[PDB]
Amino acid sequence: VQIGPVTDLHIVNADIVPDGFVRPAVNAGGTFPGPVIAGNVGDNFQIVTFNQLIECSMLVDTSIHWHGEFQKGTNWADGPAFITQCPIIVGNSFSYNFNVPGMAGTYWYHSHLTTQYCDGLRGPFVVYDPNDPDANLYDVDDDTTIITLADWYHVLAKEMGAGGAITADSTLIDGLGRTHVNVAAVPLSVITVEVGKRYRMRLVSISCDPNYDFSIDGHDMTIIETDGVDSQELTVDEIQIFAAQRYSFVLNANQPVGNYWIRANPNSGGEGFDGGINSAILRYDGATTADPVTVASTVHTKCLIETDLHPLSRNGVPGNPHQGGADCNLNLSLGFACGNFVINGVSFTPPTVPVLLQICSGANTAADLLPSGSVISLPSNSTIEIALPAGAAGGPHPFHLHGHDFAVSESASNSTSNYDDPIWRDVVSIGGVGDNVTIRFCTDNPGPWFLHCHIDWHLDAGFAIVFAEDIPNTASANPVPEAWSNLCPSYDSAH
Ligand SMILES: *[C@@H]1O[C@H](CO)[C@@H](O[C@@H]2O[C@H](CO)[C@@H](O)[C@H](O)[C@H]2NC(C)=O)[C@H](O)[C@H]1NC(C)=O
Ligand SMILES: [Cu+2]
Ligand SMILES: [Cu+2]
Numbered sequence: 378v379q380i381g382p383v384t385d386l387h388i389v390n391a392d393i394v395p396d397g398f399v400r401p402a403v404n405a406g407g408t409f410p411g412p413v414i415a416g417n418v419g420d421n422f423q424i425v426t427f428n429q430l431i432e433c434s435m436l437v438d439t440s441i442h443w444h445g446e447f448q449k450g451t452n453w454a455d456g457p458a459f460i461t462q463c464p465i466i467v468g469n470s471f472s473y474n475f476n477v478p479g480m481a482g483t484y485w486y487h488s489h490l491t492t493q494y495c496d497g498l499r500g501p502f503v504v505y506d507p508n509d510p511d512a513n514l515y516d517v518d519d520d521t522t523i524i525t526l527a528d529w530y531h532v533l534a535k536e537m538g539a540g541g542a543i544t545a546d547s548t549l550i551d552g553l554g555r556t557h558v559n560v561a562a563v564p565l566s567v568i569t570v571e572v573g574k575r576y577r578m579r580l581v582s583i584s585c586d587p588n589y590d591f592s593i594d595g596h597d598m599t600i601i602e603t604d605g606v607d608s609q610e611l612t613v614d615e616i617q618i619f620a621a622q623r624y625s626f627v628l629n630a631n632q633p634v635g636n637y638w639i640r641a642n643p644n645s646g647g648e649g650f651d652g653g654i655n656s657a658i659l660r661y662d663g664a665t666t667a668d669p670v671t672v673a674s675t676v677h678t679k680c681l682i683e684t685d686l687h688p689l690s691r692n693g694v695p696g697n698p699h700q701g702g703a704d705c706n707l708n709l710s711l712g713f714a715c716g717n718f719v720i721n722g723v724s725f726t727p728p729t730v731p732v733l734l735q736i737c738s739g740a741n742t743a744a745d746l747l748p749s750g751s752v753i754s755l756p757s758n759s760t761i762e763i764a765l766p767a768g769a770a771g772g773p774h775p776f777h778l779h780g781h782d783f784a785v786s787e788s789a790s791n792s793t794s795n796y797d798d799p800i801w802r803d804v805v806s807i808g809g810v811g812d813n814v815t816i817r818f819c820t821d822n823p824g825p826w827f828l829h830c831h832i833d834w835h836l837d838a839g840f841a842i843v844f845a846e847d848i849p850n851t852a853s854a855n856p857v858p859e860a861w862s863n864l865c866p867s868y869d870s871a872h
């Protein structure tokens with residue numbers, strides 16, 4: 378179901394049983410996943426979020442992030458609690474009013490308070506391009522070609538310990554899947570295709586943690602979009618997609634009419650596909666209504682490798698073709714010990730006053746912004762390079778930056794940098810010990826922008842910092858509506 382660009386979005390509690398185990402959830406728009414929020418590039422989104430949550434066990438306060446949307450001019454609408462807003466309290470609503478100039482592609486939205494999106498507040502967000510340069514590559518692109526991959530837990534997110542290796546209890550594809558342990562034969566999702574059509578499949582990781590090895594028995598996939606950036610066609614037979622990443626891929630429905638397994642193996646939790654875990658069904662029209670009996674290739678012979686991706690446009694790479702070839706080059710020291718993560722020696726703990734309101738109330742430098750040591754100021758109109766060397770306890774961490782996308786100058790498991798034509802994206806695996814995954818972008822967007830590992834349990838254990846981009850121009854760049862200003866006194870009064 379698709380809603381928007383102007384829409385109500387109610388946040389409710391419900392019990393659901395997507396793997397056959399009933400448990401409480403926090404839902405957007407009443408469904409899991411939430412409804413697809415959609416519009417065309419350049420359209421004004423007005424999402425009126427009604428908080429109606431009553432179940433404390435999962436927090437009755439909420440805040441929603443439109444993941445990958447740059448929010449230029451609207452930093453107050455970005456969503457991370459205590460970075461850009463205080464949460465909306467139960468009984469109140471809040472109108473997320475923003476534009477998406479320049480952006481088209483496949484995105485998603487999710488709670489951005491504590492670990493609440495794990496408890497179910499996650500949904501797809503698609504910005505359609507009426508002149509998409511990839512349109513001639515397929516026949517079908519609509520709500521039925523969206524595929525979400527979700528980890529699902531039988532423990533309430535607020536009770537996960539924390540951390541604490543945490544592992545999921547079931548992989549859901551389009552909201553359905555089977556439990557890893559004592560697997561019950563509950564219904565699987567079906568994706569239906571017709572012989573000879575081509576499909577723009579929009580593959581969205583709404584994961585709180587695991588990365589997935591996604592494949593479709595007997596079929597190939599040609600990638601045309603990465604995290605909202607159009608890419609040159611890259612045909613693969615397997616895609617490893619980390620938390621929060623998105624790909625569009627053309628599925629040519631060119632096999633005999635029949636049932637084929639769709640596979641999504643998480644890097645932790647249940648291994649393999651016994652009893653149909655980690656599975657959905659690709660069904661051709663005409664096929665018998667029965668489970669697939671297909672098998673994966675024994676060896677996947679063309680798996681996605683991030684360095685094989687290239688932008689469709691001529692994006693290039695800001696700055697100069699060598700490391701440190703930037704105006705403000707940084708190399709973050711990413712650590713873990715004693716159950717907390719750290720960036721440059723400091724574990725992130727949300728401050729009482731949101732970063733944005735600290736700035737609007739007259740804070741001027743990172744030194745003046747709380748939490749101390751969790752904010753790095755960035756100057757305006759400068760090429761930023763950030764090196765994110767891996768090694769920190771497990772691993773592999775998908776780092777994500779708000780308000781921007783970035784050139785992936787160096788990828789995982791490959792020490793060679795690329796200053797000509799790397800893919801740009803917004804969430805990137807930093808790989809393994811010895812890797813030096815490096816990103817570059819330009820500061821053309823004033824505001825406080827969160828940078829963190831998108832494994833939500835790692836974010837709650839402190840793996841984050843805020844890039845305060847152009848403090849001096851932040852207030853003037855981001856006029857806030859009074860409803861925004863009303864957020865924090867309501868929150869602090871209720872709490
Ligand atoms: C490691 O990463 C580099 C950088 O993207 C890759 O190097 C490119 O390789 C292709 C050939 O496959 C050449 O056409 C380009 O000239 C290379 N670009 C640069 C900047 O060197 C390399 O392929 C990657 N290694 C593996 C094993 O995938
Ligand atoms: Cu996100
Ligand atoms: Cu984001």
Ligand SMILES: [Cu+2]
Binds near residue numbers: 771774830835
């Ligand atoms: Cu992490």
Ligand SMILES: [Cu+2]
Binds near residue numbers: 442489777779827
């Ligand atoms: Cu975030």
